[PDB]
Amino acid sequence: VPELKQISRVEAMRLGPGWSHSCHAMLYAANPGQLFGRIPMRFSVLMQMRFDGLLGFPGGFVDRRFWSLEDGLNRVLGLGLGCLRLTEADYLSSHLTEGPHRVVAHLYARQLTLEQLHAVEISAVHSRDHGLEVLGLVRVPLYTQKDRVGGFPNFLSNAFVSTAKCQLLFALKVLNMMPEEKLVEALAAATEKQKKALE
């Protein structure tokens, strides 16, 4: 499992002006529904198709000169989702991106009810960024079908912002939503499918 280098929040705030800051939120909810009435869905996580054709989390770059990370995050979330006010209690981690540009990526996470998560989806389609920077929200399927690829492994075989794929696997692990061994196995099946596709 790929993992970015972590940095503490106070150390991230000491970075010089050459460092860009991004803030993204992983919104999720326990999901008691069953696909086809048969497949327990466990959880639903919100990601989005971005303007550049890649999957990522809601959020984006923030200006930290005169504002907290929370204010910048809520500003970008206001444009891309149209709702939600996140706080420091939702802060999860900070990672240095793989470069070559100097970017520190702050990850936020908040568990909603499924009804609240759906209300975020409804608000997102009326948002200012819809049809511009955000091309549509998608839910992450956390189940795996009997063919070992249907669902989560296939989803991981899509095209991600590299930071977002690391953040998704990191958050699913540390939030106790998926065992690490199952994340490794799903990622191995996804990489396998990507390998055979190019043949």
Binding site: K5, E11, R14, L15, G16, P17, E98, G99, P100
Partner: protein
């Protein structure tokens, strides 16, 4: 090595960035203050003792677009205490400030014999 200008990566598979050694942590470890303000402990295997980056070196030159591309160092000049690199890209040369000139993993690894600190285990 304390106080010497270096180019170093702060991850095993990352890019090499310019900075200075600030503390000898010991056991092949060093505390490094990068020119961008990031400070962390770096293994000597990740540190290159070359300043400035030598002529004809292939580097990665960062535009302020968030665009980046490979180039070749063709000159240096110090203007008002700031170092600038002349970088050639497919025949065209332009000046880049020091923090815009980095080394990819493969680019910097090719300099470890001439300038790398070590140890190399």
């Amino acid at each position: 090595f304390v106080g010497l200008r270096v180019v170093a990566k702060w991850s095993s598979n990352g890019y090499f960035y310019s900075g200075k050694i600030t503390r000898d942590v010991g056991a092949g470890k060093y505390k490094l203050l990068f020119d961008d303000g990031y400070e962390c402990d770096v293994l000597g295997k990740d540190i290159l003792l070359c300043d400035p980056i030598p002529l004809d070196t292939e580097v990665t030159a960062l535009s302020e677009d968030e665009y980046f591309s490979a180039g070749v160092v063709k000159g240096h000049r110090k203007e008002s205490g700031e170092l600038y690199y002349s970088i050639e890209k497919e025949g065209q040369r332009k000046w880049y400030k020091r923090m815009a000139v980095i080394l990819s993993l493969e680019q910097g690894n090719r300099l470890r014999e001439q300038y790398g600190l070590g140890p190399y285990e």
